[PDB]
């Protein structure tokens, strides 16, 4: 749970990375699939993985779209992402551990692209946000 300060930190940082949103998402999903090769099994029905491959690049933009939507509803994530949880946790039965790995990836891209801005304090607020989002997605597991 984020304090009100921490939510402001997250609304303010996500706004500052809007113009590089797509590139963060594509880098993140690309790194997820290169760095943690077990994640490709979830995407085996596509005809590609890893950067350059546009399917990974446009699925990364979709993920970030979901991420930017979670920011907008940062005061009730459990109730507001119920459809996405149904899909990830119930339909696809994505293993819960894959969320901490995707989050880490997104964190290194954010730091990679906004190094002066991504201070320990921003890191904490965002880390906490991503975990809370993972847990909103976890609502329909069982």
């Amino acid at each position: 749970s984020l304090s009100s300060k921490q939510k402001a930190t997250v609304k303010d940082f996500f706004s500052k990375m809007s113009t590089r949103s797509d590139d963060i998402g594509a880098e993140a999903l690309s790194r997820l699939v290169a760095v943690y090769p077990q994640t490709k099994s979830y995407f085996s029905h596509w005809k590609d993985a890893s950067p350059g491959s546009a399917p990974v690049r446009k699925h990364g933009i979709t993920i970030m779209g979901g991420v930017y939507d979670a920011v907008g509803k940062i005061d009730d994530l459990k109730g507001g992402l119920l459809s996405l949880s149904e899909l990830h946790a119930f339909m696809l039965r994505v293993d819960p551990v894959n969320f901490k790995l995707l989050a880490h990836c997104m964190l290194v891209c954010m730091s990679m692209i906004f190094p002066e801005e991504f201070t320990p304090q921003v890191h904490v607020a965002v880390d906490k946000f991503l975990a809370q989002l993972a847990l909103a997605l976890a609502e329909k597991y069982r």
Binding site: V108, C109, M112, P115, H123
Partner: protein, 145 residues
């Protein structure tokens, strides 16, 4: 695992952008602030009262460098990672009882400090190799069965 030969080139490339005197201090500074329960394991270090205290605390900096120096040792002993860290394993996992998940935390914070410094130079396959090197060390640091 069996190293590919660009896996090694990519690892030494990363390690060649790490000044341990600057990076060591910041990787640990950052783990103590982001994952603050990790502070308990370092009772000796004194004031960890806040971020200002974490970053100004000479014992944190100095240890950051020991820890990061330790991490860098497998680069020179890469097909013997396990025996290289077998004593450290016993120290962290048998004596001090550091939960193994904290090893992942420090290392995740390190990678994040590295990505800030290297920029896009740090590619996706560079990072994969890097993470293969971290997962091997961490795996070596855990309780050995």
């Amino acid at each position: 695992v069996e190293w590919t030969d660009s896996e090694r080139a990519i690892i030494t490339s990363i390690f060649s952008n790490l000044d341990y005197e600057e990076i060591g201090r910041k990787s640990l500074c950052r783990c103590l602030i982001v994952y603050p329960w990790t502070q308990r394991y370092f009772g000796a270090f004194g004031n960890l009262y806040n971020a200002e205290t974490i970053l100004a605390n000479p014992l944190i900096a100095a240890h950051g460098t020991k820890i990061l120096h330790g991490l860098d040792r497998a680069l020179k002993n890469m097909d013997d990672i396990k025996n290289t860290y077998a004593e450290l394993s016993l120290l962290h996992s048998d004596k001090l009882h550091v939960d193994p998940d904290n090893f992942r935390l420090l290392a995740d914070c390190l990678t994040v400090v590295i990505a800030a410094k290297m920029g896009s130079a740090f590619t996706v396959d560079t990072q994969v190799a890097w993470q293969k090197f971290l997962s091997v060390v961490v795996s070596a640091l855990g309780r050995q069965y």
